[PDB]
Amino acid sequence: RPVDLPAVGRMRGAELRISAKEAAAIAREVR
Amino acid sequence: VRTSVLHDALNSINNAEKMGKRQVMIRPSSKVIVKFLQVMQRHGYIGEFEEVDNGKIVVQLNGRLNKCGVISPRYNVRLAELEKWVTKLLPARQFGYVILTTSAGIMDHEEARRKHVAGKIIGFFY
Amino acid sequence: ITDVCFNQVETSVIGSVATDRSIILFDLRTNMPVIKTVLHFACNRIVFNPMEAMNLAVASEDHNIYIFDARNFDKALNIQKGHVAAVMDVEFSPTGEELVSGSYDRTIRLWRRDAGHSRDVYHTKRMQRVFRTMWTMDSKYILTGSDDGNVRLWRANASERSGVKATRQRQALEYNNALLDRYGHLPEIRRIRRHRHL
Amino acid sequence: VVNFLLFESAVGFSLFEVVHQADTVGLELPEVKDAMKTLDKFGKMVKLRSFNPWTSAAQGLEAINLISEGIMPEYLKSALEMNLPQTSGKKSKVVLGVADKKLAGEITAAFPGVQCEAADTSEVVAALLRGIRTHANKLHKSLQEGDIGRAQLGLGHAYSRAKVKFSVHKNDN
Amino acid sequence: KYLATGLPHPFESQQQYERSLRLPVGPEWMTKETFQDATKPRVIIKQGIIAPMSKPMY
Amino acid sequence: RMFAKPFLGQLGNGHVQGVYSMCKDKNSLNCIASGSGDGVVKVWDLTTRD
Amino acid sequence: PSSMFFEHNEALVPPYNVLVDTNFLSRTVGAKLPLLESAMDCLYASVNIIITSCVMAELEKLGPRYRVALMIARDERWQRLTCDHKGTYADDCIVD
Ligand SMILES: [Zn+2]
Helix, strand or coil: CCCCCCCCCEEECCEEECCHHHHHHHHHHHC | CCCCHHHHHHHHHHHHHHHCCCCCEECCCCCHHHHHHHHHHHCCCCCEEEEECCCEEEEECCCCCCCEEEECCCCEECHHHHHHHHHHHCCECCECEEEEEECCEEEEHHHHHHHCCCEEEEEEEC | CCEEEECCCCCCEEEEEECCCEEEEEECCCCEEEEEEECCCCEEEEEECCCCCCEEEEEECCCEEEEEECCCCCCCCEEEECCCCCEEEEEECCCCCEEEEEECCCCEEEEECCCCCCCEEECCCCCCCEEEEEECCCCCEEEEEECCCCEEEEECCCCCCCCCCCHHHHHHHHHHHHHHHHHCCCHHHHHHHHCCCC | CCCEEEEEECCEEEEEEECCCCCCCCCCCHHHHHHHHCHHHCCCCEEEEEEEECCCHHHHHHHHHHHCCCCCCHHHHHHHHHHCCCCCCCCCCEEEEECCHHHHHHHHHHCCCEEEEECCCCHHHHHHHHHHHHCHHHHCCCCCCCCCHHHHHHHHHHHHHHHHCCCCCCCCC | CCCCCCCCCCCCCHHHHHHHCCCCCCCCCCCHHHHHHHCCCCCCCCCCCCCCCCCCCC | CCCCCCEEEECCCCCCCCEEEEEECCCCCCEEEEEECCCCEEEEECCCCC | CCCECCCCECCCCCCEEEECCHHHHHHHHHCCCCHHHHHHHHHCCCEEEEEEHHHHHHHHHCCHHHHHHHHHHCCCCCEEECCCCCCCCHHHHHHC
16 A cells, blocks of 8 residues: 555545544544 | 646646656646645745746646645644644654645645644645 | 856856756856857756866756857757656766766766767666766766765776776776777677666 | 875884875775785885884884874984975975874974875875785885894883883892 | 678778778787787876866967 | 676765755865755765765 | 573663564554654653664665655664675564
8 A cells, every 4th residue: 555645534636535524533632 | 527726736746746757737727726836835845836828837846745635625723633633644744744724824834833823724745 | 047067177167057948158257148048948957078178068858968069059069868857967077078967767877978879877776866966086986866865876987896907907908998999889799788777 | 195105113114105096985895905905906006115224222212202102203304304305385295194193293394395194084095004014024025124023022022111111110030 | 790780980981991990909919019009098097186177288 | 798787885874855966075085965855964975985 | 692581581671672674664654653752652661763774775675655654764863774795685684
């Protein structure tokens, strides 16, 4: 697998789609 | 059709950085693209670009960057969230930058921590 | 103005390239530019000849090295064409008779001054791109600053070992070089001396 | 770029003149290390120019007790006056190669036209004096009266006894 | 395969090139002085700083 | 073609990002310097490449 | 060897010397995971973290897709153990 790919959402081309749960999951981790 | 002309531009930049070309022809121009490349040029990942008119952008690139990307839903982010967002988007905290559309403009996360302002995550490069 | 180079032989003559696909000269004694020629493609780097004061070489995005005369910019004195991607750096040997070019693909190309085609090509899977190549002042070893973060030390004359040689050793080497200068154009000798693994 | 080099040994001090000097970029190369090993490929580098032996063991003792402390002796100044071309460093210099840095500074202060390179700082002259110390028995053998082993033995004993003051409080035999 | 397929670059005539080689280089066929003078290289590089030329020689 | 072995070595550990400029000393013989892409420069001595 | 009491190495006391292989290095860059910080958080002790030139050689021999992991390895604050052998095979280098 590619190393450079980030861990939050799926990547298609240059567009990175983040589901609404994942941005909530980061806000849960901060709190 | 991808209305995200920023994503079409960044797809062209990623194709050139993979294919080893030394310039592109970003055919639909904008102003958010120009600000994005202004940040990339501040951090030295792109040599020199010009906006010519019919317009389009000619972007001399150094061969230093790895990946460009846009965050498509453009989530809002505070500073205490910004640290975790940086360390979850970048492979390392000292490599690459996250782009923010703040109330002070469009800038990187280090300039956002300098100027003490939060905002929406729009894109990233490394 | 991308590159700048003092002429080391003739002092107070400065050459420069610019992204107008142009080369410009400068006389430092009367502080003004001198002449400007527009080429077809952009030139990455200018350099001068350390033994002949008037000859210069531009490494250019036409995959090409142009050896020019600074007195008559009408035509190129020589055109070295061997590359695949753009030429990033060119450097004359301190004896003034050879050239190194590091290219934007993964190659170093060693040239004679009157050749017009590659004497040698150097490459490596670990070498990622090539940005700056320059001789040592021995004119025997070349150095390569890459995009992998590595400065590598290669040698020109890849099959010629250094150090002190005995007389019957360096006579055998000089005899082989003179014999290849004579019979180097015959078919078997030609194909074996031109074969290099790219 | 070295022109001459000093080399001090127990029988005396000799200065060699280098011709076909050593490659400085390929000093860590195996072919150049093999050249520094073999006498048939290092005697092409060095050619013996001058030799000054001691007159006596007292002069050799004074020679060590000046050179190790750093100060150059008057007869070393004499032989350098005789062998080096008389210049002052305004338009042409002579590069000498010496083993010690304090001796380098003093030879440069005594002769302004001679630029000295110390073996403690410069790797070229370090490898070159290392090769001469390697082959020092054969480079001198045409004028080496006897050997060097007993000379080094007696001179090390004389130097150690002068440093220790051994005979004035060793009496039990 | 031992014949030559075309004329080399400086030469202009078959008689010129095929009569210009004409003499073996080796030590079996020529004297020692001739062998040394005929296999001396054109550029003789000694060790040291090869600095660019200060003043015109001629 | 058999004894064509051109690679000799590599100066030190290298840089972190790529080497985007380098320059020799035209007076000396073993003084090199190289400046990388993360803006760190290094001065190398060619006699001790470790 | 001394300091070996029946498969219990008494030579390893903190600061721990940790040799890094290319597989571990590629996967610790892939898992968004900081190398020295996670090693210190695993061992609860100060590590010094070394990379052999065979490991750097295999990371360089892999293409420019792994340039980020290469830069992460080429961080300056870590010890570089130069190897004196031929093949640049990281497994046999580490085992020897
Ligand atoms: Zn190893």
